[PDB]
Design a protein around this ligand. Structure first.
Ligand SMILES: Nc1ncnc2c1ncn2[C@@H]1O[C@H](COP(=O)(O)OP(=O)(O)OP(O)(O)=S)[C@@H](O)[C@H]1O
Ligand SMILES: Nc1ncnc2c1ncn2[C@@H]1O[C@H](COP(=O)(O)OP(=O)(O)OP(O)(O)=S)[C@@H](O)[C@H]1O
Ligand SMILES: Nc1ncnc2c1ncn2[C@@H]1O[C@H](COP(=O)(O)OP(=O)(O)OP(O)(O)=S)[C@@H](O)[C@H]1O
Ligand SMILES: Nc1ncnc2c1ncn2[C@@H]1O[C@H](COP(=O)(O)OP(=O)(O)O)[C@@H](O)[C@H]1O
Ligand SMILES: [Mg+2]
Ligand SMILES: [Mg+2]
Ligand SMILES: [Mg+2]
Lengths: 316, 346, 448, 312, 257
């Protein structure tokens, strides 16, 4: 049993996180001086929040990581009783660390704690801050009640640019010597959408299923509406050719792509497209309106055809 | 004295006397049905409802209290509601719980049904659950209302006091006797004003009462308040009194006049401030839109009134879909400025 | 030497003259100090209560205020946090026998001082199944107590707390003004050897919503970024610029400008889009007004997407909202911002609306003789006519104001609090209340 | 008696059809003990719960199947994660050596918090319990959770592939199927073998013979001639006599406006228009559908549809 | 290093089941003279002072004066793992974070060495001065336990009146009233059950019964309990240890009007 590449190549120190140079720079400063505040790391998935907190805790504590760190996932019981007993008895527990080091209580998936648990956690955060530091992680930073954000530094994380994911993908390819090609790498970066863990998972799955990495093969394991078909459909809609765009639309509908997926790809492709500017904005307006109408529940092919008709009649 | 001369028996009503006799015949026959009483605001829906209750149960329906119940959302956001209750009925407005109106209906109907099982013997074998402002219930809540209205049909009757039932699901309109309370005529308002002043022993003339009626716009409560407020300032009642109007009417009117005066962004910002001062005092955005639109139409041309009317209707419609009403109000104003300036200049 | 302490603990208010929020004549901390000092006379007009209720926004000094007040008068307090179980049984088994008892701190001190008090912090955390029946037993303890209970809440407008405020001297902490916190944090940053421009200080204090703990944590992170060698206002100013973002920005970048703080960016844009002068509309007001209307339309579309995202947690519409509320208006209003990206100021208006709403609802519930409408303008006009009813007797004759005020106050079941509520509630446009327009008010509060 | 949707289930892994790439890759996973967590997603009736059940029966035995496979539906219920799933994944089975299998049918009805908890459970115990999630909308699954597991889109079955299996079912049974009854069955099925076999069995059992008319009457699907009639009333008549005719037809047979509108859309795309008229018809019909989605009167929406067609 | 081996192991067990419900976490002050423990109840109503002299421990070795905070619930849970015949050896390093308790069975090869985790406690030693109490009642422990457990059924407040002729406990509840008068005992053969009331002024105080019932949890420690009491100072319920030290409970009187 060999473990996946998402873990075999997990960065073990903050010099190897490619996510957000400013926030990771702050965290390297904290790993150097040593007096961290309670930090809430918030951001989109796959960008290196858990990894950053783990590497920070390691670089701070060192060999006392088994004795000074308490991690509580979302798969652990974290009711009000656990917050009032286990977390409190850990905060009160005595551990002797070097001058500026503190125990760390990593509450991963902090947005999954009920309000009662966070209310019971407030004063534990506040009282024992002389020897205990908290490091919460979350995706929706509004699921954390306001009094808990009041006693934490809210470090924001953002999606990854395509260059960073490409650098890390090349670092992994070099170590694994997987045969690749540029179109395959562009396909992986298109299917990733910033998630650095999604990109690695797709890379490993493609390599293990087929070996060689090319776009034709990447879209055989991801299998979302090929962006070339959507580009062609938008092009037909630019020339006010409804009967040729509905062709591609009904083709995509024949293969059973859910309309949410079709709209997601149409949006993501019409955003970075090669039309004019005013026309691009007039297109994105209508695509957003139809996306609203489909999320609401009106997901029939007639709504997609109406969207195509509007896109056509925008250009007379 | 608005609450000092409102009648208390169906035989004491001032207008819609045929409907009064009909309602008396209704409560006299057995098996009182679910009533859906509606009609423009300030026409006497609550007066008729209280009279129906006085005819239904004893006079002990006036010795009421104020209970404060707490409901729990499908999460920990607890909400507190106010139920005015008597020994035989319960008047709750299940719409202050903004989008948690589905659970309050269920729970309140359940509680009243179970309290009626505790020795309700006074004169009837059922209780009344008066729900005011029903047309603003969410559809998921009106469906629960439909279900729990039959689930406990035998022990508690419902009286839905809405207005303009247009937003009431037909499943409900098909299970409630529709009582329609029109707005009283100008003459009816004049007669009730003269009666109130004569019982007060005042000298309300025949040309001031008509001005009060024409300004009240078929709203009886507004007319009574205006009559009471033109006394607190100038008791002698002459033919040309400066009968006052509420603060927000004036504010909304001067806001409309300000929109008409200037068509500059520096004016649009002050109009945004005025709209904020109006919203903050908790007056509904539909009232703001209708009051702004009227004074606007008074200052446009007959060829422009169509576009402005449709603009107000469109914006108001959209406002009922979003969350921040100030966005749509300011959009409507901005659009009217951009249209009116282009019309007047050209 | 390495510091094993946060700024929130290095620069805590060790004294009472250091609470940044309130150092005035009658402020939340001096009112509490005077209520506590002469509590013995109970067993401000709050000397008739047996407990205080400090309530307000987070990070303003409630915990510090209560501790320093109980510490200045030599009181000794027993704090009960939200991390201590406070169900009915546990509460009436831990703190029931201590209320009518003498504290042993009153005999054996390491000087010796009586006057033991209790502090029930985070009283709105007594919710859920764990703390089942906490608030009920708490008011049952407040009813029969012999030591001052000092309860701290976080939002007085809470269902569980509404049944408690009827027994507690109601204090209310205000968000400290920006100048006070500015002076304090500038002194602190000087102590620390960290130089920050006062504009950046005002930005930090406003972005943290005047939460002193949050501004201290933000100053810590600022100094961290300084040692290592993009806020809301900055991005809000970067969306309405022209001259530098011609080739620097594309649709992906303009759409990303929304994603920095996607919870507040639409509010900033809707607030600051009106102070721009569209380069496309070269002074022609007929086109500038049209651009404003188009931007307003787009912002309403963004509001529609927002209200759709809120109901069902469908985070796939975030890009659509970024297009409607942040990028579009940008292209429509692409001129030059006049003054400054002011704060959105919509949150304060929503809070004040909620206050006026519950105030009117309470005042109207007391007028439940045979008439009621929950919170409508129906009651706003009954209450405007009631304000003109009340003020008339006293405007015209000093001798009848008392008789009529009482006759009406008791006909509709109203109180002095209700009078204060009905007076400064119908003041449109910042117009002074018709009650301040003298000598009779002094005897009016004393004789009522 | 016994439904044909169960009698002709593919018992092995090769009796699956139209997914030869996915089936070969899963079989290779099985042979090399490299089976990852699987996420099977796609439209109904396409062969997901049969693929994974064949894979299981190939992996375990029939007596190990109660103690090493947790078939759990996700539509019954965050407690289900830390309850039976965490207690099934973390514990070994006493005498059996090898991983376990957890099959979460309808894995998209799970709230997002439950999917966070389940993602941590998966990440933790990934060498003694392999998870196989099954859903219809991959968009409903948290990107975090889906990242963990390899994804397989079980799209609909093209009619060329699925016709031989229906022919084998017809020959094995005794169904006098017409040459177009097969076509009107494939069309109405819309590419899910379950619905095709169900419709076929139910019609053959109700009427006794399957043809292009019998299946259209057994499923109550609006016939093509009726929609042609409606389009003719709208396109070549007066407004009022079209309203009357369409209302009479709409009440004669059970017919709503959603179905009228869908079929009329397909016809608008079928018949020839100047290609600047169908941009109008399409826009107006896509607005009428949204209007009907909010619970409005159908007497004013039908008239709006006739108004849309009166551009001609 | 602090190492203390105690052959009479049960003592520790009993002591910890005497404190574990009144005190939640305490700060053992170890010194070359012995072990002390001053700790206030969480509600600041009751104080407890335990003293175990080093001459009572079978073997005692303290170098630097430790002050180790422990969670008396965790310590009780650890000590419940020792038989009533075990030899208990506490051991702690210079400034260690853990406290090693070795329970050695007396006549077996079973040796169980647990390692409790200390906590961080910053407590201040209250200054209790040596007083000369007005009323000192030395009675049998089981007697006092019975009195308190009985009066707890009547009401939740005991009025102790120490007059000349004898002590008198009283209580009044919603179901009635009760009072146990307890007369001084004669010079009769058994010594432990001889009540001995030495008073100077007739005192009368009112105490809570919850804390008196918490006090009586130490009855297995000794057979004679000594109630010292004066006007407006806490009741002092003292239990001796078997020639090793003592355990005193201070309870503060109710508020008098
Ligand atoms: N910024 C990054 N630099 C390098 N590797 C990364 C980065 N982000 C993610 N990874 C890789 O992705 C794996 C998982 O990332 P995580 O740290 O788990 O992200 P995450 O923020 O925890 O995502 P969640 O928890 O699902 S929101 C790590 O083991 C890394 O191999
Ligand atoms: N008025 C103030 N003056 C000085 N420092 C303050 C002030 N308010 C808050 N602080 C700082 O913020 C820290 C926490 O303030 P607290 O009084 O604990 O906040 P809080 O009112 O308890 O907020 P809660 O409990 O979350 S509702 C203190 O340690 C101080 O450093
Ligand atoms: N590829 C296939 N080969 C053979 N029979 C199939 C195939 N796909 C579907 N079937 C038949 O259709 C029936 C239902 O297929 P299922 O695998 O149950 O579909 P499903 O994916 O579970 O649909 P759900 O669970 O509602 S999303 C089975 O009993 C088979 O007889
Ligand atoms: N028959 C009547 N006679 C006199 N006054 C009436 C009558 N009906 C209504 N009113 C007046 O209207 C006031 C309230 O109107 P209401 O009954 O509440 O109608 P609505 O519920 O539509 O506002 C009463 O206080 C009373 O002053
Ligand atoms: Mg993580
Ligand atoms: Mg606090
Ligand atoms: Mg299935």
């Amino acid at each position: 049993y060999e473990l996946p590449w998402v873990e075999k190549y997990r960065p073990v120190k903050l010099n190897e996180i490619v996510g957000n140079e400013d926030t990771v720079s702050r965290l390297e400063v904290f790993a150097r001086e040593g007096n961290v505040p309670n930090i809430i790391i918030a951001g989109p998935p796959g960008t290196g929040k858990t990894t950053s907190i783990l590497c920070l805790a390691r670089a701070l504590l060192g060999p006392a990581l088994k004795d000074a760190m308490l991690e509580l996932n979302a798969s652990n019981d974290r009711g009000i009783d656990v917050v009032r007993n286990k977390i409190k008895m850990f905060a009160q527990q005595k551990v002797t660390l070097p001058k500026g080091r503190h125990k760390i209580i990593i509450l991963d998936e902090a947005d999954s704690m009920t309000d009662g648990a966070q209310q019971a956690l407030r004063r534990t955060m506040e009282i024992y801050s002389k020897t205990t530091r908290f490091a919460l992680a979350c995706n929706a930073s509004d699921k954390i009640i306001e009094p808990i954000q009041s006693r934490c530094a809210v470090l924001r994380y953002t999606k990854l640019t395509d260059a960073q994911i490409l650098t890390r993908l090349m670092n992994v390819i070099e170590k694994e010597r997987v045969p690749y090609t540029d179109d395959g790498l562009e396909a992986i970066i298109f299917t990733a959408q910033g998630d650095m863990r999604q990109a690695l998972n797709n890379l490993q799955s493609t390599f293990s299923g087929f070996g060689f990495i090319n776009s034709e093969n990447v879209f055989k394991v991801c299998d979302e509406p090929h962006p070339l078909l959507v580009k062609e459909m938008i092009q037909h809609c630019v020339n006010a050719n409804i009967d040729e765009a509905y062709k591609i639309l009904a083709h995509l509908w024949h293969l059973g792509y859910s309309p949410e997926d079709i709209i997601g790809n149409i949006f993501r492709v019409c955003k970075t497209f090669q039309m004019a500017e005013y026309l691009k904005l007039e297109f994105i307006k209508e695509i957003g309106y139809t996306h609203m109408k489909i999320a609401e529940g009106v997901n029939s092919l007639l709504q997609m055809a109406g969207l195509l008709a509007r896109l056509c009649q925008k250009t007379m | 004295w608005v609450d000092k001369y409102r009648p208390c028996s169906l035989g004491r009503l001032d207008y819609h006397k045929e409907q009064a006799a009909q309602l008396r015949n209704l409560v006299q026959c057995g098996d009182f049905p679910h009533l859906l009483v509606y009609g423009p605001s300030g026409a006497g829906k609550k007066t008729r409802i209280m009279c129906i209750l006085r005819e239904l149960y004893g006079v002990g329906v006036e010795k009421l209290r104020i209970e404060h119940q707490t409901i729990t959302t499908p999460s920990k956001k607890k909400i507190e509601i106010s139920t005015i209750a008597s020994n035989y009925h319960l008047e709750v407005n299940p719409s202050d719980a903004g989008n948690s109106d589905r659970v309050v209906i269920q729970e309140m109907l359940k509680t009243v049904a179970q309290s009626q099982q505790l020795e309700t013997n006074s004169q009837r074998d059922f209780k009344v659950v008066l729900l005011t402002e029903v047309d603003k219930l969410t559809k998921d809540a009106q469906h629960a209302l439909r279900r729990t209205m039959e689930k406990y049909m035998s022990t508690c009757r419902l009286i839905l006091c809405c207005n303009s039932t247009s937003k009431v699901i037909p499943p409900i309109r098909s299970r409630c006797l529709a009582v329609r309370v029109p707005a009283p005529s100008i003459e009816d308002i004049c007669h009730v004003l003269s009666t109130v002043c004569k019982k007060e022993g005042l000298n309300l003339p025949s040309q001031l009462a008509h001005r009060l009626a024409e300004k009240s716009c078929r709203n009886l409560r507004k007319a009574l308040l205006m009559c009471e407020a033109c006394r607190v300032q100038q008791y002698p009642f002459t033919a040309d009194q400066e009968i006052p109007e509420t603060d927000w009417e004036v504010y909304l009117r001067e806001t409309a006049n300000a929109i008409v005066s200037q068509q500059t962004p520096q004016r649009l910002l002050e109009v945004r401030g005025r709209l904020y001062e109006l919203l903050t005092h908790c007056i509904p955005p539909e009232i703001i839109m209708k009051g702004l639109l009227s004074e606007l139409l008074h200052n446009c041309d007959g060829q422009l009134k169509g576009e402005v009317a449709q603009m107000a209707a469109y914006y108001e419609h959209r406002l009922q879909l979003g969350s921040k009403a100030i966005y749509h109000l300011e959009a409507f104003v901005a659009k009217f400025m951009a249209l009116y300036k282009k019309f007047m200049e050209d | 030497k390495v510091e094993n302490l946060l700024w929130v603990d290095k620069y805590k208010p060790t004294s009472l003259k250091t609470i940044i929020g309130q150092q005035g004549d009658q402020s939340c901390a001096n009112k509490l100090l005077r209520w506590l000092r002469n509590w013995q006379k109970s067993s401000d007009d709050g000397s008739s209560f047996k407990a205080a209720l400090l309530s307000g926004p987070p990070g303003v000094g409630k915990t510090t205020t209560a501790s320093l007040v109980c510490q200045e008068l030599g009181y000794s307090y027993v704090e009960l946090n939200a991390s201590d179980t406070r169900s009915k049984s546990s509460l009436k088994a831990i703190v029931a026998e201590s209320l009518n008892n003498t504290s042993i701190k009153g005999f054996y001190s390491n000087s010796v001082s009586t006057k033991h008090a209790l502090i029930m912090d985070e009283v709105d955390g007594m919710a859920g199944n764990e703390d089942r029946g906490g608030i009920q037993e708490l008011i049952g303890l407040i009813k029969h107590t012999k030591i001052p209970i000092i309860c701290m809440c976080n939002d007085r407008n809470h269902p569980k707390i509404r049944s408690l405020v009827h027994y507690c001297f109601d204090l209310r902490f205000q968000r400290p003004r920006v100048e006070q916190i500015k002076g304090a944090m500038m002194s602190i940053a000087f102590k620390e050897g960290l130089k920050i421009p006062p504009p950046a200080m005002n930005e930090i204090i406003l972005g943290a919503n005047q939460d002193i703990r949050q501004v201290l944590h933000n100053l810590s992170m600022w100094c961290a970024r300084s040692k290592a060698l993009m806020g809301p206002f900055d991005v809000a100013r970067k969306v309405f610029a022209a001259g530098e973002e011609t080739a620097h920005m594309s649709l992906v970048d303009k759409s990303d400008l929304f994603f920095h703080d996607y919870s507040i960016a639409p509010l900033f844009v809707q607030e600051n889009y009106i102070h721009v002068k569209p380069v496309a509309a070269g002074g022609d007001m007929k086109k500038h007004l049209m651009l404003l209307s188009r931007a307003a339309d787009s912002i309403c579309d963004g509001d529609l997407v927002d209200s759709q995202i809120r109901s069902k947690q469908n985070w796939s519409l975030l890009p659509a909202q970024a297009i409607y509320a942040s990028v579009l208006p940008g292209e429509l209003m692409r001129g030059y911002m006049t003054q400054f990206p002011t704060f959105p100021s919509w949150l304060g208006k929503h809070s004040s609306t909620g206050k006026h709403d519950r105030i009117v609802q309470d005042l109207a519930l007391h007028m439940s003789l045979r008439t009621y409408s929950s919170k409508r303008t129906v009651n706003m006009d009954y209450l405007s006519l009631l304000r003109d009813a009340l003020v008339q007797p006293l405007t015209s004759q000093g001798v009848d104001g008392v008789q009529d005020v009482v006759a009406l106050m008791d006909t509709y079941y109203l109180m002095k609090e209700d009078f204060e509520n009905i007076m400064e509630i119908s003041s449109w446009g910042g117009k002074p209340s018709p009650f301040s327009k003298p000598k009779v008010k002094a005897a009016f509060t004393r004789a009522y | 008696n016994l439904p044909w949707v169960e009698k002709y289930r593919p018992q092995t892994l090769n009796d699956l059809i139209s997914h030869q790439d996915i089936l070969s890759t899963i079989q290779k996973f099985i042979n090399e003990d490299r089976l990852p967590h699987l996420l099977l997603y796609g439209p109904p009736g396409t062969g997901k719960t049969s693929t994974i059940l064949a894979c299981a029966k190939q992996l375990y035995k029939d007596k190990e199947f109660g103690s090493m496979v947790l078939e759990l539906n996700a539509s019954d219920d965050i407690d289900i994660i830390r309850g039976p799933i965490l207690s099934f994944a973390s514990t070994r089975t006493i005498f059996k050596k090898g991983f376990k299998l957890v099959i979460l049918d309808e894995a998209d009805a799970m709230t997002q918090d439950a999917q966070n908890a389940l993602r941590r459970v998966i990440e933790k115990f990934t060498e003694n319990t392999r998870f196989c999630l099954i859903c219809n909308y991959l968009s409903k699954i948290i990107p975090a959770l889906q990242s963990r597991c390899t994804r397989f889109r079980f799209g609909p079955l093209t009619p060329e592939l699925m016709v031989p299996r229906l022919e084998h079912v017809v020959e094995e049974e005794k169904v006098d199927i017409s040459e177009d009854g097969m076509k009107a069955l494939v069309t109405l099925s819309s590419g899910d073998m379950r619905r095709a076999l169900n419709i076929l069995q139910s019609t053959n059992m109700a009427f006794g013979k399957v043809t292009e008319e019998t299946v259209y009457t057994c499923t109550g699907h609006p016939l093509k001639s009726d929609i042609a009639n409606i389009l003719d009333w709208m396109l070549n008549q007066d407004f009022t006599t079209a309203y009357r005719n369409i209302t009479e037809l709409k009440t004669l047979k059970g017919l709503a406006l959603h179905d009228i509108l869908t079929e009329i859309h397909l016809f608008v795309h079928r018949v020839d228009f100047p290609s600047s008229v169908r941009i109008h018809l399409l826009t107006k019909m896509a607005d009428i559908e949204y209007r009907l989605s909010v619970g409005t009167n159908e007497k004013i929406q039908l008239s709006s549809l006739i108004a849309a067609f009166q551009v001609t | 290093m602090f190492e203390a081996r105690l052959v009479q192991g049960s003592i520790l067990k009993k002591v910890l089941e005497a404190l574990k419900d009144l005190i939640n976490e305490a700060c053992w002050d170890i010194s070359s003279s012995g072990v002390n423990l001053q700790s206030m109840d969480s509600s600041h109503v009751s104080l407890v002072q335990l003293t175990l002299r080093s001459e009572g421990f079978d073997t005692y070795r303290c170098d630097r004066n430790l002050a180790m905070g422990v969670n008396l619930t965790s310590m009780s849970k650890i000590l419940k793992c020792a038989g009533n015949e075990d030899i208990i050896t506490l051991r702690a390093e210079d400034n260690a974070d853990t406290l090693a308790l070795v329970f050695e069975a007396p006549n077996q090869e079973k040796v169980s060495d647990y390692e409790m985790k200390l906590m961080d406690l910053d407590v201040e030693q209250l200054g209790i001065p040596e007083q000369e109490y007005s009323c000192v009642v030395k009675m049998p422990s089981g007697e006092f336990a019975r009195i308190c457990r009985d009066l707890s059924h009547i009401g939740d407040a005991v009025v102790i009146s120490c007059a000349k002729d004898g002590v008198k406990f009283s209580a009044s509840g919603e179901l009635g009233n009760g009072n146990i008068k307890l007369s001084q005992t004669s010079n009769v053969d058994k010594e432990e059950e001889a009540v001995t009331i030495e008073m100077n002024e007739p005192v009368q105080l009112t105490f809570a019964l919850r804390y008196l019932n918490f006090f009586t949890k130490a009855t297995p420690l000794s057979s004679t309990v000594t109630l010292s009491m004066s006007a407006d100072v806490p009741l002092v319920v003292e239990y001796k240890i078997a020639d090793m030290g003592h355990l005193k409970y201070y309870l503060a009187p109710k508020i008098e009007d």
